[PDB]
Amino acid sequence: AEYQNIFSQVQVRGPADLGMTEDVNLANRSGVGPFSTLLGWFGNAQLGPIYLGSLGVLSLFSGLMWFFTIGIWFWYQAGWNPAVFLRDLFFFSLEPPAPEYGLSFAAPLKEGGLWLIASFFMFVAVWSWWGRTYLRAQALGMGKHTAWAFLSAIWLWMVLGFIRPILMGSWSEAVPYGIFSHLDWTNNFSLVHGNLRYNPFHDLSIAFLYGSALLFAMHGATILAVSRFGGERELEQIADRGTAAERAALFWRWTMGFNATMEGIHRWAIWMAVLVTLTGGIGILLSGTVVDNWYVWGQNHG
Amino acid sequence: ALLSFERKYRVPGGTLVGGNLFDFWVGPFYVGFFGVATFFFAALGIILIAWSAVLQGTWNPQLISVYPPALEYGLGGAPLAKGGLWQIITICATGAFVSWALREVEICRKLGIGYHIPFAFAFAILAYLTLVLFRPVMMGAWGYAFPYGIWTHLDWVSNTGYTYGNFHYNPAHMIAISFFFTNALALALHGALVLSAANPEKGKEMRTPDHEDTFFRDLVGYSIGTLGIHRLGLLLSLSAVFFSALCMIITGTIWFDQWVDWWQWWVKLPWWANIPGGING
Amino acid sequence: DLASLAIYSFWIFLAGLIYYLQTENMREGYPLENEDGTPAANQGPFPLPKPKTFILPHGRGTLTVPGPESEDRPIALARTAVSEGFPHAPTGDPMKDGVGPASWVARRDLPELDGHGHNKIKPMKAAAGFHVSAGKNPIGLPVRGCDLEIAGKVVDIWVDIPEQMARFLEVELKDGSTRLLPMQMVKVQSNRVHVNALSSDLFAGIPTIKSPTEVTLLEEDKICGYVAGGLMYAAPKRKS
Numbered sequence: 001a002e003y004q005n006i007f008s009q010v011q012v013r014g015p016a017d018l019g020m021t022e023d024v025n026l027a028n029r030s031g032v033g034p035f036s037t038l039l040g041w042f043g044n045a046q047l048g049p050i051y052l053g054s055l056g057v058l059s060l061f062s063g064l065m066w067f068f069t070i071g072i073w074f075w076y077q078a079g080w081n082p083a084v085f086l087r088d089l090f091f092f093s094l095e096p097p098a099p100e101y102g103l104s105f106a107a108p109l110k111e112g113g114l115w116l117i118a119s120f121f122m123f124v125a126v127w128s129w130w131g132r133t134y135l136r137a138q139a140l141g142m143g144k145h146t147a148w149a150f151l152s153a154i155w156l157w158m159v160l161g162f163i164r165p166i167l168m169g170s171w172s173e174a175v176p177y178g179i180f181s182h183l184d185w186t187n188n189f190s191l192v193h194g195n196l197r198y199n200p201f202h203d204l205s206i207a208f209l210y211g212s213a214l215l216f217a218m219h220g221a222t223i224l225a226v227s228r229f230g231g232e233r234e235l236e237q238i239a240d241r242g243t244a245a246e247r248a249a250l251f252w253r254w255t256m257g258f259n260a261t262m263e264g265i266h267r268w269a270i271w272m273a274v275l276v277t278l279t280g281g282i283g284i285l286l287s288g289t290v291v292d293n294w295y296v297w298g299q300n301h302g
Numbered sequence: 303a304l305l306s307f308e309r310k311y312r313v314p315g316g317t318l319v320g321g322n323l324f325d326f327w328v329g330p331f332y333v334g335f336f337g338v339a340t341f342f343f344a345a346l347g348i349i350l351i352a353w354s355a356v357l358q359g360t361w362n363p364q365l366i367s368v369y370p371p372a373l374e375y376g377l378g379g380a381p382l383a384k385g386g387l388w389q390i391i392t393i394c395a396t397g398a399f400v401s402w403a404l405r406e407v408e409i410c411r412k413l414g415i416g417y418h419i420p421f422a423f424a425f426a427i428l429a430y431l432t433l434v435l436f437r438p439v440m441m442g443a444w445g446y447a448f449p450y451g452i453w454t455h456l457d458w459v460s461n462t463g464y465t466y467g468n469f470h471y472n473p474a475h476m477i478a479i480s481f482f483f484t485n486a487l488a489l490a491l492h493g494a495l496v497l498s499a500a501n502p503e504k505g506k507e508m509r510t511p512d513h514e515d516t517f518f519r520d521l522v523g524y525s526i527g528t529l530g531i532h533r534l535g536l537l538l539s540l541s542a543v544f545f546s547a548l549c550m551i552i553t554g555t556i557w558f559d560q561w562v563d564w565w566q567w568w569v570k571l572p573w574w575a576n577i578p579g580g581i582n583g
Numbered sequence: 584d585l586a587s588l589a590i591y592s593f594w595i596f597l598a599g600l601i602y603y604l605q606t607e608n609m610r611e612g613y614p615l616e617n618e619d620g621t622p623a624a625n626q627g628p629f630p631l632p633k634p635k636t637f638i639l640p641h642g643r644g645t646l647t648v649p650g651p652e653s654e655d656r657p658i659a660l661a662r663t664a665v666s667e668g669f670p671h672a673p674t675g676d677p678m679k680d681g682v683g684p685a686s687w688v689a690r691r692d693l694p695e696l697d698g699h700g701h702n703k704i705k706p707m708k709a710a711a712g713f714h715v716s717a718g719k720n721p722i723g724l725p726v727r728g729c730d731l732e733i734a735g736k737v738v739d740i741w742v743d744i745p746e747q748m749a750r751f752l753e754v755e756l757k758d759g760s761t762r763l764l765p766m767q768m769v770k771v772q773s774n775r776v777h778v779n780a781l782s783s784d785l786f787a788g789i790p791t792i793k794s795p796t797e798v799t800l801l802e803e804d805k806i807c808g809y810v811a812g813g814l815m816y817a818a819p820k821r822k823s
């Protein structure tokens with residue numbers, strides 16, 4: 001009956017934590033949200049403050065404009081009937097301009113127009129948010145790591161609804177906005193480029209996706225295993241190595257003949273996750289622009 | 303050789319089997335009884351796989367493939383050359399993996415740390431066992447198990463999903479992908495948050511966890527916190543593999559039709575089933 | 584063609600990255616050593632990285648790694664064999680000597696600080712604001728070691744202020760002195776706090792701290808070292 005440190009046995013609360021000031025404009029921070037005892041057993045109980053500057057307002061407003069634009073469309077597919085809308089929620093789909101309209105913005109509102117409107121709002125939403133990622137780090141004097149990793153996720157999305165479609169000569173190639181429709185798009189794309197397992201960037205992206213689960217499991221499990229020596233206070237074990245960091249490393253050395261450090265594991269961790277969408281995005285972009293059938297390609301290699 | 307701080311941890315004890323008999327290392331490697339056990343099962347398996355290679359025709363690692371007993375043998379034995387090797391190797395694989403986990407428990411006992419790693423490794427082992435043992439037994443034959451080859455196990459992934467349609471419609475599979483994708487998200491965020499605090503802008507001083515808590519709060523209005531994100535990565539990962547096993551133990555067993563049709567339960571609900579309009583009206 | 588170029592180029596980048604990453608994980612514990620502490624012949628195929636320097640924050644200096652690496656203390660172990668690769672048996676008491684699973688590292692003998700420059704861990708008794716918000720409050724409960732004997736009474740909770748978590752329970756012994764015990768090695772029960780790692784007679788041996796309103800990183804390490812180590816060295820006086 002030894003404690004495991006997956007859930008906290010006792011919670012503790014104190015004055016709301018308002019954060020660090022520095023070069024952060026404190027006029028754009030909200031106050032503190034409430035405290036959740038539910039969250040508290042697993043993580044931190046405090047919600048907020050949040051920093052809602054103008055780039056964030058811009059971002060949040062387009063984000064919602066995109067979602068609402070899809071949502072409006074869904075109601076029109078449902079003939080404004082609540083029971084229908086819930087019933088078929090996963091079946092609705094806001095599809096892009098058919099092939100004949102190319103990269104044009106002419107296709108009518110109900111047959112492509114709305115799709116484009118939605119995408120526009122998503123475009124500025126994501127790119128505004130990325131900017132924020134950078135700007136919030138910058139105001140704290142921290143490295144730009146969160147933004148460079150985000151870019152990688154962005155790479156996949158950009159290729160999927162913007163770059164590939166443009167290189168292919170039409171917005172018809174882009175992904176539709178819907179739950180089942182995007183799954184069908186996915187299956188569909190695969191049956192047309194012949195054997196998705198012979199796309200080498202697709203395989204590698206899979207190796208990194210599973211590898212990210214293996215690495216977060218290893219990592220997470222390792223920090224809990226040495227949380228009885230202060231293990232999760234990583235920055236200080238980076239700055240002044242302790243027995244947490246030591247027995248962590250030596251578990252792995254004795255298990256598989258090599259190990260990491262408290263700092264280096266996070267380098268391994270950020271590359272494992274980033275590579276997923278880095279290699280995936282290359283895999284997709286090349287599909288149908290350069291290579292029409294990964295099986296054929298894999299027979300010649302050109 | 304030893305890392306510079308290791309010698310103090312290389313003391314006797316913690317083994318589960320044999321006492322002092324295998325309490326030693328070979329280079330960096332710890333060896334318990336179970337280090338001996340993993341070597342035995344793993345070198346048998348490697349040998350039997352090599353043996354399977356010769357009967358097959360090639361030495362090409364990309365062609366070597368070892369198939370399970372054709373469906374015809376059900377859950378009985380089979381001649382080595384027709385799924386017998388797969389049955390022995392699978393036992394060895396099981397042995398090698400379980401032994402690796404228990405060896406891990408031995409390294410944990412020596413080092414004074416929680417057992418969380420070997421336990422997590424056991425979710426992978428259970429996913430492995432579900433494809434090669436739990437599904438097939440429930441299904442009445444070894445033959446529904448995947449083959450062992452770099453590219454034929456991939457063929458088997460497709461063949462087994464397209465037997466149910468777009469396998470995307472498996473709903474346990476959807477939850478599983480959600481956790482894989484959410485795990486990757488989180489691992490990029492964690493790697494990047496700690497790094498960015500430890501490597502600040504040039505010339506500046508190392509940031510602190512508070513700075514870490516502030517950065518996430520500023521960006522999304524909430525930070526899970528350093529204990530919490532290691533808890534979160536563990537949970538997300540293990541839940542991915544758990545939903546993976548679950549999405550597959552229920553496939554070909556309680557559900558064997560096309561997973562896209564499973565969703566008709568929802569649309570065929572009395573209150574809106576016959577209402578006109580929508581996609582299904 | 585373009586796809587085979589991308590793939591050719593990608594394998595080269597991945598090999599460079601593994602190399603970069605592996606050498607980056609050589610900034611501690613290297614160079615490798617023989618069991619007597621001298622530099623090993625075979626260091627492996629990855630060269631040590633050019634050094635880097637962390638600027639520590641509340642006037643505490645810098646850290647440059649790699650750098651000349653010294654255990655900053657005596658290790659009470661001797662060999663049990665005439666050749667490489669076997670276990671080193673403790674020469675005295677492994678719990679007191681701080682070896683094996685009872686090890687500790689000579690961390691700075693200053694306490695950790697938050698971003699405001701205030702000690703990060705303080706006892707709740709002096710943490711303005713801070714109270715127990717959910718779960719059984721342990722303060723006041725009897726403390727039982729693995730021998731099934733009472734060793735003490737919980738008299739306070741040491742808390743991480745910035746991160747708002749329970750880090751240690753402050754326990755009081757028969758003589759009136761206190762010991763800090765790691766939260767993660769205790770079990771908070773309805774009518775008791777149970778410590779599986781230590782026997783009732785090993786509570787007095789837990790490394791004490793110099794001040795009652797703060798704990799240094801060196802003391803945490805001696806504390807956590809000592810209670811984890813009981814899992815192995817307290818086995819005889821353990822039961823169930």
Ligand code: BCL
Pocket residue numbers: 197202203204206207208210211214347348351430433448452453455456459
């Ligand atoms: C799990 C879901 C499906 C499946 C779906 C896929 C898909 C889809 C893909 C793979 C791919 C791979 N799979 Mg698979 N695979 C399954 C079950 C397995 C099992 C198993 C014992 O259960 C193993 C060992 C593998 C192994 C592998 C690798 C050959 C390859 C890259 C994996 C990776 O990065 O993981 C992440 C882990 C790490 C980074 C740690 C490194 C692990 C190493 C690299 C594995 C080497 C194994 C070796 C070749 C096996 C022979 C061992 C000898 C007998 C000694 N698969 C089940 C049947 N697999 C990818 C591929 O590239 O094939 C060409 C791919 O796209």
Ligand code: BCL
Pocket residue numbers: 122125126153154156157160186187188189190196197201202205206207209276277279280281283284459483486
């Ligand atoms: C039947 C389908 C085909 C197939 C077709 C495809 C196709 C097509 C693609 C993949 C891709 C991927 N596939 Mg495949 N794949 C198949 C079989 C597999 C198998 C398997 C076991 O058999 C596995 C394990 C995988 C695994 C994977 C992933 C590694 C990879 C996606 C990574 C990712 O994180 O994207 C998820 C991450 C993103 C989509 C980026 C998100 C970024 C943006 C910026 C976020 C916007 C958020 C927005 C503003 C909304 C906010 C909402 C919030 C509430 C606020 N595939 C089968 C054979 N696969 C992708 C790829 O890279 O392939 C090379 C892809 O395009």
Ligand code: BCL
Pocket residue numbers: 186210399426427429430432433458459460462463464468469470475478479482543545546547548549550
């Ligand atoms: C066309 C094919 C179908 C499809 C059919 C299937 C099938 C069929 C299966 C999956 C399974 C999975 N699919 Mg699907 N899937 C499709 C599309 C997708 C897409 C996508 C983008 O479209 C994604 C993201 C996924 C995602 C996933 C995962 C949920 C899951 C696999 C991970 C796993 O189980 O690891 C679990 C971990 C393991 C199996 C590995 C454990 C290894 C062991 C413990 C140790 C190995 C050691 C080794 C010998 C190395 C030693 C040597 C060296 C020392 C390293 N699928 C399409 C629609 N999918 C698989 C799954 O759910 O399995 C339960 C499954 O069987």
Ligand SMILES: CC[C@H]1c2cc3[nH]c4c(c3C)C(=O)[C@H](C(=O)OC)c4c3nc(cc4[nH]c(cc(n2)[C@@H]1C)c(C(C)=O)c4C)[C@@H](C)[C@@H]3CCC(=O)OC/C=C(\C)CCC[C@@H](C)CCC[C@@H](C)CCCC(C)C
Pocket residue numbers: 210211213214217218221255256340343344345347348351391394395398399402406419420422423424425426449450451452455539540541543
């Ligand atoms: C939540 C579960 C995630 C996870 C976690 C995880 N994996 C782990 C651990 C943990 C916590 C370990 O402690 C352990 C580890 O030590 O990593 C270094 C491990 C591990 N995960 C591994 C692989 C692995 N894990 C994977 C997945 C995952 N691991 C999950 C996503 C995957 C995939 C495909 O996603 C792979 C490929 C090993 C690197 C390692 C365990 C090493 C080991 O057991 O050595 C023992 C045995 C041998 C040296 C080889 C014996 C093999 C022979 C008997 C015959 C060959 C068998 C046959 C099945 C071949 C299959 C061929 C394929 C082409 C299909």
Ligand SMILES: CC[C@H]1c2cc3[nH]c4c(c3C)C(=O)[C@H](C(=O)OC)c4c3nc(cc4[nH]c(cc(n2)[C@@H]1C)c(C(C)=O)c4C)[C@@H](C)[C@@H]3CCC(=O)OC/C=C(\C)CCC[C@H](C)CCC[C@H](C)CCCC(C)C
Pocket residue numbers: 059060062063064067125126127129130133146147149150151152153273274275276277483484486487490491494521522
């Ligand atoms: C390395 C690749 C992995 C990765 C990394 C990654 N993602 C990232 C980052 C990084 C490093 C960020 O910094 C950034 C981040 O901020 O996260 C906190 C992000 C992020 N990844 C996101 C999603 C995401 N990432 C994903 C994937 C991945 N991200 C990869 C696994 C996926 C998928 C499909 O797997 C998704 C869906 C976002 C949380 C965030 C980017 C936020 C953003 O750009 O949005 C703009 C602002 C808005 C759109 C507001 C919109 C509001 C909602 C659309 C409506 C609300 C929906 C809700 C259901 C209710 C709605 C309320 C209304 C009814 C009132």
Ligand SMILES: COC(C)(C)C(=O)C/C=C(\C)CC/C=C(\C)CC/C=C(\C)CCCC/C(C)=C/CC[C@H](C)CC/C=C(\C)CCC=C(C)C
Pocket residue numbers: 067068070071072074116119120122123157158159160161162175176177178179182
């Ligand atoms: C309850 O009803 C109300 C009204 C309250 C609602 O709000 C309901 C709302 C809904 C039910 C909302 C549902 C929203 C979804 C179902 C969305 C589904 C989303 C996915 C499955 C999306 C998947 C993939 C998306 C991709 C790849 C997007 C790519 C975007 C682009 C890169 C954008 C590129 C730019 C374009 C095309 C514009 C070009 C023009 C310029 C000037 C730049």
Ligand SMILES: CCCCCCCCCCCC[N+](C)(C)[O-]
Pocket residue numbers: 029030031032033034047048049050522523524
């Ligand atoms: C300027 C004072 C007004 C702000 C007070 C309102 C509290 C909101 C805090 C947001 C926290 C919630 N969040 C970000 C998780 O969504």
Ligand SMILES: CCCCCCCCCCCC[N+](C)(C)[O-]
Pocket residue numbers: 257258330601605626627628629
């Ligand atoms: C997919 C990741 C592959 C990891 C390969 C890295 C090899 C580990 C190098 C360790 C050898 C060095 N050592 C122990 C002498 O320092």
Ligand SMILES: [Fe+3]
Pocket residue numbers: 219223234266492496532
């Ligand atoms: Fe970490």
